Amino acid sequence: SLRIAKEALTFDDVLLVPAHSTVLPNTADLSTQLTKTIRLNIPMLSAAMDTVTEARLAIALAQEGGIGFIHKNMSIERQAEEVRRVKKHSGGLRVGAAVGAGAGNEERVDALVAAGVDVLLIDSSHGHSEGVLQRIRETRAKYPDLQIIGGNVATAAGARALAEAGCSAVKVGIGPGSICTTRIVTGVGVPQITAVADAVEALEGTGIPVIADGGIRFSGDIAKAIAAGASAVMVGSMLAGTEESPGEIELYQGRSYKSYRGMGSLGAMSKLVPEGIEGRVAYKGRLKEIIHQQMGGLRSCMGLTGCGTIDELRTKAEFVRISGA
Amino acid sequence: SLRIAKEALTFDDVLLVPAHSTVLPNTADLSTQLTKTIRLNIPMLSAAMDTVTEARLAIALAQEGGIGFIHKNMSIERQAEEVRRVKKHSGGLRVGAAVGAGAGNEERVDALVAAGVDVLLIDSSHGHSEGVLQRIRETRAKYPDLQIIGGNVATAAGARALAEAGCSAVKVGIGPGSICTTRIVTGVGVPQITAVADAVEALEGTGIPVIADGGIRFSGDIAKAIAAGASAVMVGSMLAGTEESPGEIELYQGRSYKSYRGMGSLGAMSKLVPEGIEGRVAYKGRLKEIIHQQMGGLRSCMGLTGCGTIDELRTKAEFVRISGA
Amino acid sequence: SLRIAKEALTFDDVLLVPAHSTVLPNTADLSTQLTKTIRLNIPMLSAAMDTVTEARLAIALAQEGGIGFIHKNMSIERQAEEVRRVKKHSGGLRVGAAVGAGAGNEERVDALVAAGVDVLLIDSSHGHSEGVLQRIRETRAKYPDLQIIGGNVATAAGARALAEAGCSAVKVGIGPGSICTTRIVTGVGVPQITAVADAVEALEGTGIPVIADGGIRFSGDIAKAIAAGASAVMVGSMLAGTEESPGEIELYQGRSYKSYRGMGSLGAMSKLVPEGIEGRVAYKGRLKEIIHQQMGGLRSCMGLTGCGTIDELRTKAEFVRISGA
Amino acid sequence: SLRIAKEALTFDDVLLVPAHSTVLPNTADLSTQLTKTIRLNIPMLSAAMDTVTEARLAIALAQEGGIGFIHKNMSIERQAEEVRRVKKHSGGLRVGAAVGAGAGNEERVDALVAAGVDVLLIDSSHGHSEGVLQRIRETRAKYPDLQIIGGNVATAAGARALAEAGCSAVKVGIGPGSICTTRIVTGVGVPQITAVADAVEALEGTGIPVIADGGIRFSGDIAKAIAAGASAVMVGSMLAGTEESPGEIELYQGRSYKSYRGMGSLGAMSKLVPEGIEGRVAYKGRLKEIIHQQMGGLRSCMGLTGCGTIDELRTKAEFVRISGA
Numbered sequence A, B, C, D: 001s002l003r004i005a006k007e008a009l010t011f012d013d014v015l016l017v018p019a020h021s022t023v024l025p026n027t028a029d030l031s032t033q034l035t036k037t038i039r040l041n042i043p044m045l046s047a048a049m050d051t052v053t054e055a056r057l058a059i060a061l062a063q064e065g066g067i068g069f070i071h072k073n074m075s076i077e078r079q080a081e082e083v084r085r086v087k088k089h090s091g092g093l094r095v096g097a098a099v100g101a102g103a104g105n106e107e108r109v110d111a112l113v114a115a116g117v118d119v120l121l122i123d124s125s126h127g128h129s130e131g132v133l134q135r136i137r138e139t140r141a142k143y144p145d146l147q148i149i150g151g152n153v154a155t156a157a158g159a160r161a162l163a164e165a166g167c168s169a170v171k172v173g174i175g176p177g178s179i180c181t182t183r184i185v186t187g188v189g190v191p192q193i194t195a196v197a198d199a200v201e202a203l204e205g206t207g208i209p210v211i212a213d214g215g216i217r218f219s220g221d222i223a224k225a226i227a228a229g230a231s232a233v234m235v236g237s238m239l240a241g242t243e244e245s246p247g248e249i250e251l252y253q254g255r256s257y258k259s260y261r262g263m264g265s266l267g268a269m270s271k272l273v274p275e276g277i278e279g280r281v282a283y284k285g286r287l288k289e290i291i292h293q294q295m296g297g298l299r300s301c302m303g304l305t306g307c308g309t310i311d312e313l314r315t316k317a318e319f320v321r322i323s324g325a
């Protein structure tokens, strides 16, 4: 018999239900616990991608109440300096940095901790791999108070494995990324709404938050991911093409564009087969206006569902399942 | 676990079932109770939109047996005068007018009642909000015999809240509008066929009619909304572009067009994020021919289902659920 | 609660299951009982449409083993003569003719019986209407041995009503036609695979055959309709544009075309609202080659399912339900 | 009642679930048992098609660890020589050859066995036909140790019939082929994921492997077919257009192309109605690079699911069912 574990739902399969409300959108509280010790003012994390987050974007997002993750596609010294630029900037801004879950990253981790990184991100395409869990346990043993985010997983067993390995937060997302091709390459993936809810249910009572990573296209997707139980979302394409993101602005016909590619694309890699594409994204302008629009959407959702806080949205808001029609 | 209340159906998910009939389409009775005191000759209400209903369109629709709703996107004096133009016109025509459910609308309400409004519409994007319910209770206490329509809701709890607050009729529709973007902006919405049936079931035995507002594209949608339990439908895009609607006729290539926009669009608003789009609709001609075609479709449905009255269509007609294919 | 009778399936929702077979496609028997007295060599009926069947097409199809139905969109004398042309032609060919189920058709019926019609077709868009049933009972009382086909219905109750009224065969199809717009105009319809199976189940043990009318696009649709329980299919678009069909061949760019329209289209009608469209269909050539291709498809199905006769296909062949993917 | 055996799933209906892993993609073992005596290094079989496999392609694939099947669309002497070219080539390469399941193929079979064929393929569009089973039983009685593959089937009963008739391996696939039109022509077919799992369940404990034949578009489809229980896959379009495939390279605008057609197409046939199309496929280059890319995809799947061997992927990997969205 076919080994079907369950049916799984994506953002477009569901809608949030309007409910009794004493919440006006302008009164909604967007603060969230990223970890037990780190509280963000907005539930936004920027992707650890070489076309998305470097010190400039990490500074702009932290200023909006979120947090950036400096990508690992650079030298140890360049990354430690990128972290130093964010930390040494005025305002007491928080920063995160990504590391590979393979052998020979102890040096990179030691440098980032010294540079003052607030949260270390163990960046894996398969968080349920034994090698990833081992590296996390080792990092936890060496740095007992360091805030660690481990990912990516898309199951209850995967979330429990990362929490047991020492993770301060668990990142969810196997195949939902706008630039992902793993569903076609490996045939592997879990629709994000089910992936998040499963990971959240597995971690109930532990105080370990879940980050919904990948596939956020609109502010409505942000709202859905949070009501599925995520404490925050991680975005790539939503912040790609912004002024603050790395790389140069390019002109095609008349419209301005920026590069956006998966970290598993042929370009980002230069022997695994690619699991990501290389694309062009339209120039979005300043990050501040993007965040204001998206958070505004989230605020209006909170008004419609009568959820005054992120925690209320996470635990009270209900969904309806819809057809393709 | 994912908090899925139920699966919800839209117009395209269902079809009406043909049944034994002694009803010829030309013999079908289209009259309906809008409220316990107001009976319409056709189950048609025009949308309270600045690109749809002003005195001219309200006069033409009332002449066809329906009722118009003068939009709130004007001064108090202009609106009271628009109501006076419809009331003072010969034929003893009925009119409705829309008001916001916020603070400082008591003055607008007093002026509309003085002008002779037959039905006051409390026009909210979220009828289940405490502020909306409070304003309704206050209006009911001040004007005990005034016919009041409150909306919008899309749940059984929302319909009960509006009926308990004093509403003479409840308006249903969260996200189905042709110009709506709330599903993408907030992630909130309820497919209209389920939304209507839920609200109708909640109000059974109360004598409070349900209005199906939004997403009516064809006469088949009208028939479906009524068999889902609605006593009448409210239409925006179906009457936009008609000769009688406000605004000027514009020429693009050779074809004539008129403006059609959500009341939550950037244009209609000029700090909430927009929940509606701004568009162009083809010039439809006289309202009379549109109503004759649409009511004709409804008449043929009534013949096919053997339902001689609106009340029979509401309570007897059955559906089949269909796939995307 | 929403009055959903059941889920209903169309041709594209299902596939036939291959089974043990001793049947080669060239050995399959395509003969079928249209009525208890009329046996056809192929399960094909041509539509009673003014762009499909007149004496020329009725002669060509009867020669292939099927039967034509002369449309009612002409004078009584012209129709009686069209029937006489088919009957008086050599080969002992069978013909059918269509009549409206309204008042003042007794004269048309008397003329067709005199002209030698083998099967009278009471042609209604709503066979479950009391007026249709009454006219059938009257025709049966006047002509006790006349083969009568009544339609259209799409339910078990509708099939039983027609069989009780005196029908020799029941025609199924509410909304499946390629040129139908009733689903959009009235919101009424039943997906054809469910409609046929329901009507067949209602008539089990009665010996009254079911005709699957409308929506046949490919030979695979023919096979599915028969395995759903239909004894024969009725086709419009499949035979439109053939050399033998009425009307003139028209040239557009370089390709040859013929007119194809619903009997409920504005053109075919010239006060009901139209329930059909007016279109152009590509010139198909001789009917003989179309029938050879389509029957060939049916033969290969019979080989794949191990069904040597139409009756075996009707009662033994199984389906699988498929998704949109 | 409608005779629906069950719902059936295709590749796009499912996704593989990531799981605990100690498997790195470079460490995955791709070897598989094609039969109890024949073990392949990669789970790849090339289609027995006149636009896909001749001696040149059969040599290149065997060199990669797979096996080719020389098509039957040639003379007995040409086919025996094509088999001799592969066998006599250095490296001790294995080859297969296809034969029709009709009368007068005993001569073709005797010649292929003499030429040194490692596996005889009884090539039928309907493996559950009595004629096919009879020819297999006869071949098994004459050549008791000859490795025989019989197909095609898409049910549990069909798999059991082929295994009982003497098949060393069973081939599954009724309608999934990229160039197949049987779903439209006959209305027959079974979605491949259900077809494979059903055939595998029927053959559990017998040691008779199942080959998933048809519809493989991406490496993700390969992974899914194997986790559905197939020991190997058979590919047509994936290897069409390669340098090693038969036929000439053609130039259209600037891009290079090769012919790809079903064996049931009008062209491949030159009295059954065609069940396949004739098309052009882009020139893919050397087979070696195609296999490296596709096997790489399979390796990454094995890493994601924690399945170190083909047998582990076949029996341990789980699926989630997804919607169209």
Ligand SMILES: C[C@@H](Oc1ccc2ncc3c(c2c1)CCOC3)c1cncc(-c2nc(Cl)c[nH]2)c1
Residues within 6 Å of the ligand: A124, A125, A126, A129, A152, A173, A174, A175, A176, A177, A180, A182, A263, A264, A265, A272, A273, A274, A275, A276, D023, D024, D025, D300, D301, D302, D303, D304
């Ligand atoms: C080619 C490259 O692809 C990526 C890179 C980054 C990703 N980042 C996040 C996600 C995915 C990613 C894929 C795919 C799943 O969804 C989330 C890659 C890099 N290193 C390891 C793998 C791998 N290991 C196993 Cl085991 C199977 N393949 C893949």
Ligand SMILES: C[C@@H](Oc1ccc2ncc3c(c2c1)CCOC3)c1cncc(-c2nc(Cl)c[nH]2)c1
Residues within 6 Å of the ligand: A023, A024, A025, A300, A301, A302, A303, A304, B124, B125, B126, B129, B152, B173, B174, B175, B176, B177, B180, B182, B263, B264, B265, B272, B273, B274, B275, B276
């Ligand atoms: C921007 C503007 O958008 C509209 C306007 C009119 C509407 N009229 C009807 C409907 C919708 C509408 C949206 C959306 C839901 O479906 C029906 C708006 C105006 N004032 C309040 C809101 C709001 N309050 C909460 Cl709380 C959340 N957002 C939204």
Ligand SMILES: C[C@@H](Oc1ccc2ncc3c(c2c1)CCOC3)c1cncc(-c2nc(Cl)c[nH]2)c1
Residues within 6 Å of the ligand: B023, B024, B025, B300, B301, B302, B303, B304, C124, C125, C126, C129, C152, C173, C174, C175, C176, C177, C180, C182, C263, C264, C265, C272, C273, C274, C275, C276
């Ligand atoms: C306009 C015209 O439309 C047709 C004509 C022929 C048809 N022939 C077959 C079918 C349909 C047809 C619709 C629609 C349903 O599917 C099968 C029409 C002609 N006379 C009566 C009706 C009618 N009576 C009720 Cl009561 C409701 N409307 C409709």
Ligand SMILES: C[C@@H](Oc1ccc2ncc3c(c2c1)CCOC3)c1cncc(-c2nc(Cl)c[nH]2)c1
Residues within 6 Å of the ligand: C023, C024, C025, C300, C301, C302, C303, C304, D124, D125, D126, D129, D152, D173, D174, D175, D176, D177, D180, D182, D263, D264, D265, D272, D273, D274, D275, D276
């Ligand atoms: C026209 C030709 O078509 C093919 C040829 C090769 C195929 N090879 C594999 C598959 C299919 C094929 C169809 C269709 C089903 O899926 C797999 C054909 C050749 N000889 C027999 C048949 C046949 N016999 C029965 Cl009985 C019904 N029709 C069909």
Ligand SMILES: O=c1[nH]cnc2c1ncn2[C@@H]1O[C@H](COP(=O)(O)O)[C@@H](O)[C@H]1O
Residues within 6 Å of the ligand: A047, A048, A049, A152, A173, A175, A176, A177, A178, A179, A180, A181, A182, A213, A214, A215, A216, A234, A235, A236, A237, A238, A261, A262, A263, A264, A265, A275, A276, A277
């Ligand atoms: O090449 C890749 N393949 C698959 N997923 C990737 C790749 N690179 C990054 N990702 C993921 O995709 C996310 C961005 O998704 P987006 O916001 O939908 O564009 C990142 O945060 C990663 O988890």
Ligand SMILES: O=c1[nH]cnc2c1ncn2[C@@H]1O[C@H](COP(=O)(O)O)[C@@H](O)[C@H]1O
Residues within 6 Å of the ligand: B047, B048, B049, B152, B173, B175, B176, B177, B178, B179, B180, B181, B182, B213, B214, B215, B216, B234, B235, B236, B237, B238, B261, B262, B263, B264, B265, B275, B276, B277
């Ligand atoms: O900006 C907006 N966003 C969402 N819904 C709106 C907006 N403006 C009006 N509506 C609703 O949409 C209805 C019109 O829907 P339509 O008939 O499908 O075009 C109105 O009666 C309102 O209930």
Ligand SMILES: O=c1[nH]cnc2c1ncn2[C@@H]1O[C@H](COP(=O)(O)O)[C@@H](O)[C@H]1O
Residues within 6 Å of the ligand: C047, C048, C049, C152, C173, C175, C176, C177, C178, C179, C180, C181, C182, C213, C214, C215, C216, C234, C235, C236, C237, C238, C261, C262, C263, C264, C265, C275, C276, C277
């Ligand atoms: O105007 C019309 N509307 C709806 N159905 C029609 C109309 N005219 C004919 N039909 C039906 O459509 C059938 C033809 O369907 P087709 O074979 O799919 O084109 C006829 O046999 C009638 O039952």
Ligand SMILES: O=c1[nH]cnc2c1ncn2[C@@H]1O[C@H](COP(=O)(O)O)[C@@H](O)[C@H]1O
Residues within 6 Å of the ligand: D047, D048, D049, D152, D173, D175, D176, D177, D178, D179, D180, D181, D182, D213, D214, D215, D216, D234, D235, D236, D237, D238, D261, D262, D263, D264, D265, D275, D276, D277
């Ligand atoms: O004409 C045909 N019709 C249907 N299936 C065919 C035909 N010719 C070959 N096939 C099947 O299609 C397979 C190739 O499928 P593909 O890999 O999806 O292109 C072959 O291995 C056969 O089983």
